[PDB]
Scaffold this active site. Structure first.
Site, PDB file in Angstrom:
ATOM      1  N   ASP D  64       0.615  66.165  34.777  1.00 38.36           N
ATOM      2  CA  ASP D  64      -0.292  65.560  35.596  1.00 38.36           C
ATOM      3  C   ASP D  64      -1.549  65.259  34.813  1.00 38.36           C
ATOM      4  O   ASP D  64      -2.297  66.529  34.945  1.00 38.36           O
ATOM      5  CB  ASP D  64      -0.277  65.896  36.928  1.00 38.36           C
ATOM      6  CG  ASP D  64      -0.914  65.400  37.994  1.00 38.36           C
ATOM      7  OD1 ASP D  64      -2.078  64.743  38.031  1.00 38.36           O
ATOM      8  OD2 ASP D  64      -0.286  65.224  39.139  1.00 38.36           O
ATOM      9  N   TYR D 157     -11.026  53.349  44.302  1.00 38.81           N
ATOM     10  CA  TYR D 157     -10.637  52.676  42.890  1.00 38.81           C
ATOM     11  C   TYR D 157     -12.106  52.382  42.133  1.00 38.81           C
ATOM     12  O   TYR D 157     -12.279  52.488  40.923  1.00 38.81           O
ATOM     13  CB  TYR D 157      -9.701  51.721  42.838  1.00 38.81           C
ATOM     14  CG  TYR D 157      -9.074  51.435  41.713  1.00 38.81           C
ATOM     15  CD1 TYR D 157      -8.060  52.006  40.969  1.00 38.81           C
ATOM     16  CD2 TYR D 157      -9.365  50.207  41.054  1.00 38.81           C
ATOM     17  CE1 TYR D 157      -7.548  51.635  39.765  1.00 38.81           C
ATOM     18  CE2 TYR D 157      -8.977  49.681  39.646  1.00 38.81           C
ATOM     19  CZ  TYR D 157      -7.892  50.405  39.022  1.00 38.81           C
ATOM     20  OH  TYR D 157      -7.421  50.046  38.007  1.00 38.81           O
ATOM     21  N   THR D 194       2.463  44.757  35.663  1.00 41.65           N
ATOM     22  CA  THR D 194       2.904  46.216  35.701  1.00 41.65           C
ATOM     23  C   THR D 194       3.608  46.886  36.931  1.00 41.65           C
ATOM     24  O   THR D 194       3.339  46.094  38.025  1.00 41.65           O
ATOM     25  CB  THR D 194       1.701  47.398  35.331  1.00 41.65           C
ATOM     26  OG1 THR D 194       0.789  47.516  36.579  1.00 41.65           O
ATOM     27  CG2 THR D 194       0.763  47.009  34.306  1.00 41.65           C
TER      28      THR D 194
END
Ligand SMILES: NC(=O)c1ccc[n+]([C@@H]2O[C@H](COP(=O)([O-])OP(=O)(O)OC[C@H]3O[C@@H](n4cnc5c(N)ncnc54)[C@H](OP(=O)(O)O)[C@@H]3O)[C@@H](O)[C@H]2O)c1
Ligand SMILES: NC(=O)c1ccc[n+]([C@@H]2O[C@H](COP(=O)([O-])OP(=O)(O)OC[C@H]3O[C@@H](n4cnc5c(N)ncnc54)[C@H](OP(=O)(O)O)[C@@H]3O)[C@@H](O)[C@H]2O)c1
Ligand SMILES: NC(=O)c1ccc[n+]([C@@H]2O[C@H](COP(=O)([O-])OP(=O)(O)OC[C@H]3O[C@@H](n4cnc5c(N)ncnc54)[C@H](OP(=O)(O)O)[C@@H]3O)[C@@H](O)[C@H]2O)c1
Ligand SMILES: NC(=O)c1ccc[n+]([C@@H]2O[C@H](COP(=O)([O-])OP(=O)(O)OC[C@H]3O[C@@H](n4cnc5c(N)ncnc54)[C@H](OP(=O)(O)O)[C@@H]3O)[C@@H](O)[C@H]2O)c1
Ligand SMILES: [Mg+2]
Ligand SMILES: [Mg+2]
Lengths: 251, 250, 251, 253
Positions: D64, D157, D194
């Site tokens: 991670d 984001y 994606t």
């Protein structure tokens, strides 16, 4: 003639330096202002240096304190009416390259410089949208949100985050007719306690290779661009970057 | 009183954005000379703002290099030394790069680029080293920041103005000229330029263009020019001031 | 594998410096190339310094000569087939501030640096559109299209114009499904005869306060980003600025 | 050309088991690099690695990117497999479809732990492990067009990608001024097909609108792989601190 008539503003970190001048000129232009800071001692003398409790007050608050933000808005509302203006100015610096930044330094700086701006912006939107207030959120980035500095890696990250997160907030508010604007201010070097307490910083940053004007700015230089952005004079400006830097980023 | 003592030239100051810049400059204490190509429109514009004690019209094509020295001379005789130059005169051509005739190319750049160069160059020469808090405000556009498929020559002119202005700002700063140079980048503004282009306001009010869902007004650009002309902005030079309803933020 | 298999490129100013390396790596990657320049002596040497007339040829053409652009294209198509790639590289410099620039100097520089790029871009779009060529127009801007230089006023104007005009062309080509891409390349200082002939330019630009890498680049540094932009590898890149500058614009 | 453009490079690609990172790893191996790909899910990661090649050229490591201690183990593992790391692609990232107004504080911290802290950990460690070794080292940090423009429904984001954009310039400058032989650049894809985009219903249709992407379609992972090959190769030895935008024209308008 009062360019901020009826406005009520929260200025985080408004007890010293740039935040102090912002609050000073906000009151001079007719706004009611609440300044915040961590040290209650320096805080209320800062407020009293500007005016009485009828125009300016101090609320002790760490900008990284999520819960305190709700109380800060509540307190300002009881004091002067609905909040129209939020200046997310509180911030700290760390003189470390990315390579040399400890994870503790990284997290501590980002919790103030990024999380605090997020907390103020999110709550500002929720609390002033759809009220016809000509509301304005002014997020303090830096020229360090536009160019890199090899010895301010964490700071660069935080100010670049503030730069673009503010555009997201501006766009959402505009597309939803919230009557809230969000913009970022990008000061170059300014003579403040932060710069004064960094040995040789003013002399380094006054180099023409850094600031072409050959000197650093004064806190009133940032105060006046914030007055413009808080006022309805700038009702068509949102999501934009306002650079006051002596030419630093132009070369 | 924010422009107390200032003496400003505003090219293309008889209509639209330039007219509002002139209006608010006078309102804040500046003495103002507006220019334009048509004397009828110009004289009506000037008296619509004030008497000859504060505002006057001079007929001048911004692409007319020789007239620029005459324009400074006339302004100085009326109001004293010029302190503020707003290179606002500009024209548009609705053509892609592919479809732009060389005549259209040369004509638009002679006003939008050559004219701004003439005013900036002369402004530096006439205002440097006089302690005037001099300020040159060059009108770019959002089309100096992003492209428009049907405005190729305009894009070229406004990108040129954007970067040439930084050159001037740096030279003036490094030489201690006491002259600042900045660019203003309006989004779509309700002016005769937009009003006489059928459907333009409806097109640019689309949320995919201007997120605020409407276009701006000339006073939106006047107020940022007041900030830039005043000593309030004494630490701002070489920078881009964008007033566009969010257009470039997405 | 030839990354430019079947491509046919016009490189203006391809007899020296950046343009020469662009043509060199283009032919190395399988393109057929026509290079232009004003001096036929240098130009003939440059072509055969790279390959034979079956892969590369020289055409004497001033980039500012609008009519010659039509015959340059004609000559290139008759030699190698339809042009697929135009790199608008020819350009000159003038060491004058805006304040000191004569109108003669202003007009000369922009005739080459701006008008020439316009002529090649406009005609490139007309001749290459709707032909399934994977066409690519590469317009040579500069870091001086991104930041100012106090002693290159006309040059700054020309490279800022190239930067944004190319975006217009890229958008129109993409919205109209022309199968033409348009991008700009922004070199930092590069060791070329342009730089060598200006006394002290390499030393000035090698200062760490100018180029953080402490040296200037070489022509192959720009050739390789151009190969990427000319190849189908970059089929989704259009309207963008490709900066190869040793860090100059990152500070 | 006739030579492997990444001959001798040893690359770590975080989030290299799907989408953009998978294509970066694939083209890196094609150009002669040895690659370690990471991801949180070993079922996906082991299949991704074998889909590209054998353990002589590519290996998966479960990690991670927000796990700081694991970054040290990841570099140690990569060195033991392939030798000194030369290339770090900080690509792992997640998305959260919320406006700034609507972002919960836990959504905020989760996304930034991966998209920002993970890129910081990888950049800092990459500088420490690759500096002064003459490797032609290169750190490629995956930003986005959303590090350049705002998106009203991707507030966290946006913050993360703006941070990556400017933090990378700081690192590029420090490495250059100190002669570390480490370059740092950011890549800014527009919309790319994606699993990230595939799993957000309607996202491809929305970003295919001409008002969003002027080419009228979204990209493919190989579009980002090829600019990453350029940035990892010694071809780009003069490129540092810069933003490489591959977006179909999205930000040109
Ligand atoms: N000065 C410059 O050169 C410059 C340049 C570009 C950008 N900036 C930005 O401008 C802003 C103001 O900077 P400055 O130079 O005026 O700084 P300063 O002189 O150090 O003042 C900072 C103010 O913020 C307060 N503060 C600090 N941490 C806080 C926290 N966690 N919660 C609430 N308040 C806090 C301080 O009060 P307490 O200490 O009592 O908390 C002080 O009033 C900062 O965001 C900075 O990043 C400054
Ligand atoms: N409106 C917008 O949406 C917008 C957006 C971004 C930027 N801008 C820029 O802002 C500036 C003002 O635009 P606007 O929309 O206000 O235009 P406008 O309404 O068409 O007004 C143009 C003004 O300039 C004058 N003018 C035109 N050509 C001239 C020349 N060669 N020499 C001197 N004066 C001349 C006109 O008077 P005469 O016709 O009598 O000469 C008129 O006063 C322009 O540079 C434009 O590019 C406009
Ligand atoms: N070198 C740098 O540091 C640098 C940095 C950023 C951008 N650039 C840009 O990169 C491009 C190439 O520069 P460079 O340094 O390689 O230049 P250079 O060494 O001076 O070579 C320029 C080439 O262009 C040709 N040329 C000049 N004027 C021309 C005209 N009017 N028509 C056709 N060809 C012409 C020259 O041949 P003839 O003399 O025989 O015509 C020569 O082949 C220029 O656009 C420059 O602005 C350079
Ligand atoms: N797709 C686009 O349009 C687009 C555009 C601009 C930028 N980007 C950026 O490009 C990068 C790759 O995006 P993508 O679209 O290829 O995403 P994707 O299809 O979801 O693939 C993401 C990859 O990252 C891994 N990953 C996720 N969280 C992780 C963590 N905490 N630690 C390690 N690995 C993790 C995933 O594997 P596990 O889930 O098994 O861990 C997977 O291998 C991201 O940074 C994204 O922000 C994408
Ligand atoms: Mg710089
Ligand atoms: Mg846009």
């Amino acid at each position: 003639t009062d360019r901020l008539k009826g406005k009520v503003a929260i200025v985080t970190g408004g007890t010293l330096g740039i935040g102090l001048a912002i609050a000073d000129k906000f009151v001079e232009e007719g706004a009611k202002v609440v300044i915040t800071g961590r040290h209650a001692d320096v805080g209320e003398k800062a407020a009293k240096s500007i005016g009485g409790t009828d125009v300016i007050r101090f609320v002790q608050h760490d900008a990284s304190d999520e819960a305190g933000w709700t109380k800060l808005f509540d307190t300002t509302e009881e004091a002067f009416g609905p909040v129209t203006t939020v200046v997310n100015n509180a911030g700290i610096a760390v003189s470390k390259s990315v390579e040399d930044t400890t994870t503790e330094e990284w997290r501590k700086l980002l919790s103030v410089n990024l999380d605090g701006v997020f907390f103020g912006t999110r709550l500002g939107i929720q609390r002033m949208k759809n009220k016809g207030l000509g509301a304005s959120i002014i997020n303090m980035s830096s020229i360090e949100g536009l160019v890199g500095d090899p010895t301010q890696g964490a700071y660069n990250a935080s100010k670049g985050a503030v730069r673009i997160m503010s555009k997201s907030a501006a766009l959402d508010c505009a597309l939803k007719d919230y009557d809230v604007r969000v913009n970022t201010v990008h000061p170059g070097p300014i003579k403040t306690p932060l710069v004064d307490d960094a040995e040789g910083a003013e002399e380094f940053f006054s180099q023409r290779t850094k600031t072409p004007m050959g000197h650093i700015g004064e806190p009133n230089d940032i105060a006046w661009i914030c007055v413009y952005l808080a006022s309805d004079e700038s009702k068509f400006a949102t999501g934009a970057e306002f650079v006051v830097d002596g030419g630093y980023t132009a070369q």
